[PDB]
Curated annotation (Swiss-Prot), chains A, B:
Homodimer. Each subunit binds overlapping and non-identical half-sites that flank the central CG base-pair in the pseudo-palindromic motif 5'-ATGA[CG]TCAT-3'. Interacts with the mediator tail; the interaction with GAL11/MED15 is direct. Interacts with the SAGA histone acetyltransferase complex. Interacts with the SWI/SNF chromatin remodeling complex. Induction: Translation is induced by amino acid or purine starvation, or during growth in low or poor carbon sources. Translational repression during nutrient-rich conditions is dependent on four uORFs (upstream open reading frames) present in the 5'-UTR of the mRNA; these promote ribosome dissociation. Translational induction occurs in conditions reducing translation machinery efficiency, leading to ribosomes scanning over the uORFs, and increased translation of the mRNA. The rapid translational induction is followed by transcriptional induction at later time-points, independently of the uORF sequences. Residues 89 to 100 and 106 to 125 define the N-terminal activation domain (NTAD) and the central acidic activation domain (CAAD) respectively, which can function independently to promote high-level transcription of the target genes. Residues 5-26 are annotated as: Leucine-zipper. Phosphorylated by the cyclin-CDK PCL5-PHO85. Belongs to the bZIP family. GCN4 subfamily. Disruption phenotype: Abolishes recruitment of the mediator complex to the upstream activating sequence (UAS) of amino-acid starvation responsive genes. Decreases RNA level of genes involved in amino acid biosynthesis and cofactor biosynthesis during amino acid starvation or methyl methanesulfonate stress. Growth dependent on amino acid supplementation. Sensitive to amino acid starvation. Sensitive to purine starvation. Decreases cellular glycogen levels during glucose starvation. The chain holds residues 249 to 279 of 281 of the full protein. This is General control transcription factor GCN4. It is found in: Nucleus.
Length: 31, 31
């Protein structure tokens, strides 16, 4: 359950970086 | 430390939803 929470943090960070990369691409298009 | 991981999951989810909202606004501008 400790490991499960750790896995979830790691998964959400990966998703966050994927979203940050998307934001950056879209801002490059607008900018 | 269980609580600390839980807090971190909650924080990353909030950040993720903030990024998803930003993506949606930018796509509305492009679309």
């Amino acid at each position: 359950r400790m490991k499960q929470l750790e896995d979830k943090v790691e998964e959400l960070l990966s998703k966050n970086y994927n979203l940050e990369n998307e934001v950056a691409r879209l801002k490059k298009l607008v900018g």
